[PDB]
Structures are given as structure tokens and as C-alpha cells.
Design an enzyme around this catalytic site. Sequence first.
Site, mmCIF file in Angstrom:
data_model
loop_
_atom_site.group_PDB
_atom_site.id
_atom_site.type_symbol
_atom_site.label_atom_id
_atom_site.label_comp_id
_atom_site.label_asym_id
_atom_site.label_seq_id
_atom_site.Cartn_x
_atom_site.Cartn_y
_atom_site.Cartn_z
ATOM 1 N N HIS A 188 60.918 84.717 47.042
ATOM 2 C CA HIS A 188 61.887 85.345 45.964
ATOM 3 C C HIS A 188 61.671 86.620 45.566
ATOM 4 O O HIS A 188 62.381 87.206 44.920
ATOM 5 C CB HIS A 188 62.013 84.336 44.688
ATOM 6 N N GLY A 205 55.089 87.809 36.094
ATOM 7 C CA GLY A 205 54.085 88.809 36.917
ATOM 8 C C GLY A 205 53.156 87.944 37.693
ATOM 9 O O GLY A 205 52.291 88.715 38.682
ATOM 10 N N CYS A 256 53.641 85.330 39.500
ATOM 11 C CA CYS A 256 54.083 84.702 41.069
ATOM 12 C C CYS A 256 53.276 85.130 41.955
ATOM 13 O O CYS A 256 52.649 86.274 42.107
ATOM 14 C CB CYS A 256 55.536 84.931 41.017
HETATM 15 O O1 LIG Z 1 57.595 86.088 36.862
HETATM 16 C C1 LIG Z 1 58.410 85.356 36.862
HETATM 17 C C2 LIG Z 1 59.875 85.391 37.563
HETATM 18 N N1 LIG Z 1 60.476 83.850 37.272
HETATM 19 C C3 LIG Z 1 61.906 83.711 37.789
HETATM 20 C C4 LIG Z 1 62.436 83.059 38.943
HETATM 21 C C5 LIG Z 1 63.817 83.562 39.561
HETATM 22 C C6 LIG Z 1 64.198 83.253 40.712
HETATM 23 C C7 LIG Z 1 63.462 82.071 41.518
HETATM 24 F F1 LIG Z 1 64.227 81.685 42.577
HETATM 25 C C8 LIG Z 1 62.336 81.667 41.078
HETATM 26 F F2 LIG Z 1 61.821 80.645 41.822
HETATM 27 C C9 LIG Z 1 61.878 82.064 39.897
HETATM 28 C C10 LIG Z 1 59.551 83.134 36.536
HETATM 29 O O2 LIG Z 1 59.694 82.084 36.329
HETATM 30 N N2 LIG Z 1 58.397 83.898 36.386
HETATM 31 C C11 LIG Z 1 57.327 83.481 35.777
HETATM 32 C C12 LIG Z 1 56.286 82.600 36.245
HETATM 33 N N3 LIG Z 1 55.294 82.174 35.444
HETATM 34 C C13 LIG Z 1 55.408 82.202 34.121
HETATM 35 C C14 LIG Z 1 56.601 82.859 33.515
HETATM 36 BR BR1 LIG Z 1 56.363 83.146 31.555
HETATM 37 C C15 LIG Z 1 57.364 83.559 34.137
#
Ligand code: A1JGV
Lengths: 301, 304
Positions: free
Chosen positions: A41, A143, A145
Amino acid sequence: SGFRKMAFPSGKVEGCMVQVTCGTTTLNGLWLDDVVYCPRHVICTSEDMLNPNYEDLLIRKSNHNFLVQAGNVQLRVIGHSMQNCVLKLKVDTANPKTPKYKFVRIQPGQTFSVLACYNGSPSGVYQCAMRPNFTIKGSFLNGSCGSVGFNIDYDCVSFCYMHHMELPTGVHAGTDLEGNFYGPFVDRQTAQAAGTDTTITVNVLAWLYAAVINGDRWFLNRFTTTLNDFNLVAMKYNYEPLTQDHVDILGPLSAQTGIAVLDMCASLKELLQNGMNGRTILGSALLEDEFTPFDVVRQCS
Amino acid sequence: SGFRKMAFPSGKVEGCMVQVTCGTTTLNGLWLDDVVYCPRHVICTSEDMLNPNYEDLLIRKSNHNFLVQAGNVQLRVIGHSMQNCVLKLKVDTANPKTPKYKFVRIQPGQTFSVLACYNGSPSGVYQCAMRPNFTIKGSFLNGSCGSVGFNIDYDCVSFCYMHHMELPTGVHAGTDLEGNFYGPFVDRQTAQAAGTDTTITVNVLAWLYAAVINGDRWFLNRFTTTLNDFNLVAMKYNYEPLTQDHVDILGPLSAQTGIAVLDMCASLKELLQNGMNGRTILGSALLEDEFTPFDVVRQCSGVT
Ligand SMILES: O=C1CN(Cc2ccc(F)c(F)c2)C(=O)N1c1cncc(Br)c1
Ligand SMILES: O=C1CN(Cc2ccc(F)c(F)c2)C(=O)N1c1cncc(Br)c1
Ligand code: NA
């Protein structure tokens, strides 16, 4: 003595963390040998979020659209491919700090260490378990991920989790390092929700054995139970079923303490009925389910 | 979202851990520049440990009585001296993995990461607080002496703890890296006991702020209190006094969440008097006191 939620030392993983940028999106990647693994992603824009066609998005990219930074050094991307929900970026340098490693897919109830990272740099390390509903209860911000989950039994790092997203209840979903999701989740921003979670029964029993090893016996009782009667009661408190495999796995802890597995089951039934009546077990007022049988044997003695 | 007991990444300290053997005793040492630091009790037998004269035991030892292994490589000891309760073994090679570091002494209430080690090999990392009674509630087995505790403040590792012993109640005692014990303990086999412990009030308040930031809000209430009335209550429940300095330190969290420290103190008063009424906070049925205000801000803001 003592008993603590203990993570593996993170140094072997710290030396593999890099930053991956594509467009305006930055996240973390894992650099092993000459390949960088990261969530696919990273190639999505704002538009893309609901119904991304990843194959179509990726075919439009060249190697030089991916910026990979390892500390202060840009690596050169010389190849790219997608496997399930992970991107693999071939780079022109093998990581000189690559540890002995393998990729393992884990089952619910298994524990691992998480190295939380932002912008390719490590922030902290903590212990997690794969919940029965295939989520993890982590600590992650925007951030994070591409942060990974691992065990290090011996000198070999077993990578088992890569972080992809946060669900609306504040819990976390991700993949193994072959890019297959744990549970029914997908890397799209459509409505998805974790199923109701349950307590990991075999782990609670392990932790009661830990309490006995460390000298606490207050919660034992003179009773036993059949496996089937135990499961009938436990499920009324949202506990996972205990299987004969789980009973077998607890054999060594049973032999060490002299308490038969089904007698420990009877202790747990009574705890569920009575609560703790102002007492604690290993410093907790709740029953702990994020230590495995293997974790207990490794930490205790 | 989420809130977890989180340790610092341990890699910079892992590259400093070695094995020290003297006679039939093996434990861990810390290799920085050209010196290995370890507990002075490494030189003792069981009999000695009953009533050791360290200066007298040490003068009998040569450099070659200390076997030091960094991974699979022997280091050469070229000197030995003592500083308080730590032994310093001068070696012929500077550690090429020495990080930027300092030795700091911490105050009760402050937290740090422990890297538990056995035979010079790191086995696990966890977070601890220095208790008001100067013990730590660690997890240590035979062979863990010389394990260290630390914080990371930038790229600089601040070493604050070296493990020396387990007390009869199963809690742990040790020194700073200059070899001064935390608490009224000595490195000998005689009867020793932890004093009665108290709860770290400022840390509980920090954790309540963490809960609010993560959406857990049921314990908030319309009331406020004074420092003096709150402190009368804390005393009654074996909580450390809250000072104006503590109030100042929680200032950021108060402004961020809209809950003044003395407003949060009224929440905590009620929790002490009434309990939790079946409820949990951040998944706990007990009030947690091993997160500092700084810990909470760092984890809820992403510092790396
Ligand atoms: O940084 C991010 C981005 N995100 C969104 C996302 C969008 C499209 C996709 F296909 C997907 F798999 C995930 C998301 O959940 N984080 C997040 C991860 N961990 C704790 C937090 Br607070 C935020
Ligand atoms: O490994 C050892 C050895 N040891 C001996 C000792 C006794 C009295 C002293 F004053 C002293 F300096 C040393 C000791 O306490 N440990 C220990 C340390 N942590 C957790 C465990 Br289980 C054991
Ligand atoms: Na209030």
C-alpha cells in the site's frame, strides 16, 4: 525469580530497518540480503484507498520511483515485484548486518516481539500475541506501517508479522512476510471489523503454572474436571476451547509442578466463578493470556 | 492507538555485553572503550560472600585470573581495579561498537529498560521502574548478575543500573555504573529485606492521561481538589506525596487533554476510595505506576 512481559533483544532487527518512499507516502521496510520487504500500500494515493488495483498501480512504476534510505545512505532499487500484499524491492547492496533468519507464519495464541519504527528508525520494543480473532493489540501511530514482529529462539530471527493497518476498535492487522494477511482482512479502506475476541485459555493455564513455579499456590483447589466440562464452563466466559493438543503441550509444566493439567483447569474454573477477592497473581488482578507454554519455560526455572 | 509497556531498542547495549569468569563464577560485564565493568562479587566464593574483604581478595588475583569473552573472542585483561561495588577490568582492545554513552544515577519513580543477559549473551528486554524502596521488580535467574539498565535520550545511551542480587521477597537490587547501591543494601550474604514500598503517584496520573488519550474516559468526573487535600488521601493509601514539581511536569498532558492535574487528582481520589467497580483502564484492573510522564508523551507522539 520475578515474571515480566519480556521481549527479545531487538538489535538483529534494528540493523535491517529502512525507510521506503513512493510519491508522498513514507513507511518502513525490512532489508534482508539484497531485498527490501514493505507493505504494497506504499504505492497507493489518496484516491486509491477504497478499491486499489495493485497490479495496475505497480505496472506504472519504475525502479527509480522507489526511494530507499538505510540510515544516511540511499540504496539503489534495481528490481521490484509483488507477492500477495507485500512489495519486494531488489536493491544493489546486500545488507551487511543481515542476521540468520527465516519467515514463519504463526497461529493464534503465539507471541512475538514488535519493533515499532517510524521513518526507518526504531522507537521501542514490546511483546504481543496473535489474538484468536487474528488481530494484535499493539501500540502504533501513523507511519508505523512496515514495522515487524519476530522471535529469536537461538541465534536465528523468525519474522512472523508485518504491520499494515489499524482497525476502528484501535487494534491492529497485518501479514506474514510472504504478504498473506492474518485473518479475513484486506489492504483496502472498506469497512471491516474485528470479530469478538476471546481469551487464550492455554496461555492462561501456562501463566497459572508460572505462578506456582514462583511460589504461589493460593488459587489451587482439591477438585478436578473432565476436558468437556471445563470447555462447557470456560466458553460461557468467552474463553477459547482447550484441545487435547493444548493438554499435551502443558505436560512439561504439569510434571515440573506436580499439578495435573485437568486439576489446573479446575483451579481456573473456580477463578472465573469467584474472581480474585482482592488478591493478585504474579502482580496482576486479571488473568493474563499473552504468555505461551514455551514462554513460561524459557523465562522460569 | 494502543498503549504498551515499551522498552528502548536494545541493539546499542547488546554490542557491549561480554562474559566474565573468575574461578568457578561466570557472570556478565559491560565493555565500553577499553574497560569491562562487572559486579565486584565475581571474585568471591560462597564462604567469602558471607563476610568478604574485597580489597584483600582482589590483591591475590592476577590479570590472567579474569577470563573475558566477547562472543567467541577472548579479550586480554591488562589491569584491574575497584570503584565502590563494581570491578573495572582494563582490556587491550577498545570496543569498536562502543555507543555514545554516559553513566547516570536515577531517582525513585524513574523508569528504564533492562537487558537481561546470561553468559554474556542477551536473552530478553523489559521495562522497570526504580521503586520508592529502591528495589526493582525484575525477572532474573542465576547467571544474570552484571545485566544492565539504561535509557536512550538522543543517540546517547544513559546507563543507570547494574544487577547484583535478588532479595528474599523475589525483588532485585543493584548499583549505578559507578558501583553505588540503590537503597540500603550491601553485596554480602546476610539477611536483607526490602522496606515497605509505596505507589508512584505522578506515574499513575501519567497513565490515567495515557488512558484518556486512548479513549478510556469513564473515571473522569466534574470535581477538582487541592494538593493538600489530595496529599492527605495519598498518604492514607500509601501513595507518594505529589509535589508542585510533579504538577508542573504533567502540564503538557493537562493542556493536551483538557483535564487539569488537580481535576485528574479528584478522579484518582475517587478510584482509591471506591475502586474500579468492575471496570478496567487500558486493560488493567490495578492502577499502573511504571510509566513516567515522559514515557507517556514519547509513546503517544512517536519519538524514534
Ligand atoms: O499509517 C497508517 C495508514 N493507514 C491506512 C491504510 C490505508 C489503506 C490501506 F490499504 C491500508 F491497509 C491501511 C493506517 O491504518 N495507518 C496506521 C497504522 N497503525 C496505526 C495507526 Br494510528 C495508523
Ligand atoms: O546469580 C546470583 C548469585 N547471587 C549470589 C549473591 C548473594 C548475595 C550477595 F550479596 C551477592 F552479592 C551475590 C544472587 O543473588 N544471584 C541472583 C540474581 N538475580 C536473580 C537470581 Br534467581 C539470582
Ligand atoms: Na475531576
